[PDB]
Amino acid sequence: GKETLIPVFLILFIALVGLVGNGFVLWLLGFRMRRNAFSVYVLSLAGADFLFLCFQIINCLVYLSNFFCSISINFPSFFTTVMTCAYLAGLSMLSTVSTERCLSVLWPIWYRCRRPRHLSAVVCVLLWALSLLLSILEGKFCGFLFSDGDSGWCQTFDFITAAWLIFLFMVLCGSSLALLVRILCGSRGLPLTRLYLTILLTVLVFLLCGLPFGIQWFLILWIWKDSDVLFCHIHPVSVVLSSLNSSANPIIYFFVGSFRKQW
């Protein structure tokens, strides 16, 4: 009732801020600005964040509508799976950005010369395809499509997305660690302080705001089986942190990188 309403206003505000940020990033990198090999990843991450933030706006707006106006807007059940696809694709883009930075620092000669030009596009397409495959197959077995599926085979396939999520986190932490070792061992001209500050900032953002929604939604919910406690308190906060993470992602990745020279 009232205890859920106060997080939901935070959801709509943070979602609107991240919405206008992701829209600006999408428009700029699509049309106005020249694209690097790396800019494709930021564009894809903004696109993956868009769907998730728009669906958060929908899911809070109809909660306002149901609470005050009581219209009882029942939804199509396949919104959840495309929202899950958006979330997983955003996290995959985060980890792939980290690995691309590590590959650039470790092998500079290969990254300048021998790197294929469409490698960023093919990696983005493959990770989006794998995210969509893990999303709809979690959707069909758990009832978030036309047909309904068994809950017993739901948890077998849902834990696969959780294991993939933990692997996707360990890839981000492992690759950001190797870059730090390389720049702290024998790198001369780089700005070290700003560099480890921004790397550590991305690591804490991805661990504290990106992970908890997925962890709680998939792996945590099934194992705990403490329904009264979990939904009322844990769930509202989990969405907000994950929603917050999507909003802060354009600011961290594109706007700090691009608009630094302007201010």
């Binding site: 309904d148 809950s151 739901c154 769930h235």
Partner: peptide
């Protein structure tokens, strides 16, 4: 469905 829903 099978899931709690949000």
């Amino acid at each position: 469905p099978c899931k709690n829903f949000f």
